[PDB]
Design an enzyme around this catalytic site. Structure first.
Site, mmCIF file in Angstrom:
data_model
loop_
_atom_site.group_PDB
_atom_site.id
_atom_site.type_symbol
_atom_site.label_atom_id
_atom_site.label_comp_id
_atom_site.label_asym_id
_atom_site.label_seq_id
_atom_site.Cartn_x
_atom_site.Cartn_y
_atom_site.Cartn_z
ATOM 1 N N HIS A 175 0.871 -1.152 0.000
ATOM 2 C CA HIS A 175 0.000 0.000 0.000
ATOM 3 C C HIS A 175 0.933 1.234 0.000
ATOM 4 O O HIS A 175 1.983 1.209 0.651
ATOM 5 C CB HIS A 175 -0.914 0.055 1.260
ATOM 6 C CG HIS A 175 -1.700 -1.191 1.453
ATOM 7 N ND1 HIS A 175 -2.988 -1.326 1.028
ATOM 8 C CD2 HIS A 175 -1.337 -2.423 1.923
ATOM 9 C CE1 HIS A 175 -3.422 -2.571 1.314
ATOM 10 N NE2 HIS A 175 -2.483 -3.250 1.864
ATOM 11 N N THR B 268 -7.318 -5.568 5.569
ATOM 12 C CA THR B 268 -7.488 -4.085 5.443
ATOM 13 C C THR B 268 -8.235 -3.694 4.179
ATOM 14 O O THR B 268 -8.432 -2.484 3.949
ATOM 15 C CB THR B 268 -6.151 -3.378 5.530
ATOM 16 O OG1 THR B 268 -5.416 -3.648 4.324
ATOM 17 C CG2 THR B 268 -5.391 -3.683 6.786
HETATM 18 C C1 LIG Z 1 -10.154 -12.440 0.285
HETATM 19 C C2 LIG Z 1 -9.474 -11.499 -0.734
HETATM 20 N N1 LIG Z 1 -8.625 -10.620 0.109
HETATM 21 C C3 LIG Z 1 -7.512 -11.032 0.592
HETATM 22 O O1 LIG Z 1 -7.117 -12.227 0.453
HETATM 23 C C4 LIG Z 1 -6.680 -10.117 1.423
HETATM 24 C C5 LIG Z 1 -5.386 -10.500 1.820
HETATM 25 C C6 LIG Z 1 -4.589 -9.625 2.576
HETATM 26 C C7 LIG Z 1 -5.064 -8.344 2.922
HETATM 27 S S1 LIG Z 1 -4.120 -7.254 3.883
HETATM 28 N N2 LIG Z 1 -4.146 -5.833 3.090
HETATM 29 O O2 LIG Z 1 -4.805 -7.093 5.168
HETATM 30 O O3 LIG Z 1 -2.810 -7.814 3.933
HETATM 31 C C8 LIG Z 1 -6.382 -7.972 2.560
HETATM 32 C C9 LIG Z 1 -7.169 -8.834 1.795
HETATM 33 ZN ZN LIG Z 2 -2.371 -5.175 2.524
#
Ligand SMILES: CCNC(=O)c1ccc(S(N)(=O)=O)cc1
Ligand SMILES: [Zn+2]
Length: 257
Positions: free
Chosen positions: A93, A195
């Site tokens: 990010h 997130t």
């Molecule tokens: C289910 C589809 N979304 C994901 O697999 C997902 C993975 C990591 C993060 S984070 N930005 O918290 O690392 C957010 C979303």
């Molecule tokens: Zn992330």
């Protein structure tokens, strides 16, 4: 669809994903004066020697470097974790300028970017089952500041021209994620969430204290990506971060004195 635009950003997400206002949302501000050293926390074990990267994908919100997670090749263990967590993907990010971009903050400081190495608990068999569990995921978060270049990041930034727009992917084999780590593995940890939607409360967060340095030129290349698909009006992929959420009934623990 959700995003980080003028009308579909983080303050809107709750309408489709009510857990956005839940009890263990991420990211959070890390107050270094309130986090307590926990001498029961173990060193983190990062075992990336057998990692197999496969592909890099612009998914319209970030780019993901994906790994083969069909066996215990790249795993995270120790620290606050019980059991073995397999690396599935990493992504970042980042901001439109150097003074913002991270999701976690440290005493309200925003870093230029934040790397997330996403791992799933193998006791649940697959990623999709892991995200339904409160201990399903472990995300290793690493801050980026702008200064000297990070040599081990350059292979990533040089492929970005090939995945400019949403839905584009490129082969990305033999990338060694050890080249993205800082010297020290001292960390903070707390229970939280994805997130981005669906914002599931399935993450043990492990946030390293030592940032990595990247060059201005490297981060500038992240900022030439596009949120949009090919042929659509260009919207630069910048400010793809969620701001800090309420800590609620959580404690942030430090691995270090
Ligand atoms: C289910 C589809 N979304 C994901 O697999 C997902 C993975 C990591 C993060 S984070 N930005 O918290 O690392 C957010 C979303
Ligand atoms: Zn992330």
């Amino acid at each position: 669809h959700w995003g980080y635009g003028g009308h579909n950003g983080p303050e809107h997400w709750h309408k489709d994903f009510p857990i956005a206002k839940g009890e263990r949302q991420s990211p959070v501000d890390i107050d270094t004066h309130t986090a307590k050293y926990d001498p029961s926390l173990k060193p983190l074990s990062v075992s990336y020697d057998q990692a197999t990267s496969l592909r890099i994908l612009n998914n319209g919100h970030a780019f993901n470097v994906e790994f083969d997670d069909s066996q215990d090749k790249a795993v995270l263990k120790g620290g606050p974790l019980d059991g073995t967590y397999r690396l599935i993907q990493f992504h970042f990010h980042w901001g439109s300028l150097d003074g913002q971009g991270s999701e976690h903050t440290v005493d309200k400081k925003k870093y230029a970017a934040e790397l997330h190495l996403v791992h799933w608990n193998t006791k649940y068999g697959d990623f999709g089952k892991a995200v339904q569990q409160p201990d399903g995921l472990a995300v290793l978060g690493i801050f980026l500041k702008v200064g000297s270049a990070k040599p081990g990041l350059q292979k990533v930034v040089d492929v970005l021209d090939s995945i400019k727009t949403k839905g584009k992917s490129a082969d990305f084999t033999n990338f060694d994620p050890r080249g993205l780590l800082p010297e020290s593995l001292d960390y903070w940890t707390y229970p939280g969430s994805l997130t981005t939607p669906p914002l599931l409360e399935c993450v043990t967060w492990i946030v390293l204290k030592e940032p990595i340095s990247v060059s201005s030129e490297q981060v500038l290349k992240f900022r030439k990506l596009n949120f949009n698909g090919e042929g659509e009006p260009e919207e630069l992929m910048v400010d793809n971060w969620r701001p800090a959420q309420p800590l609620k009934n959580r404690q942030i623990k430090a691995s270090f004195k």
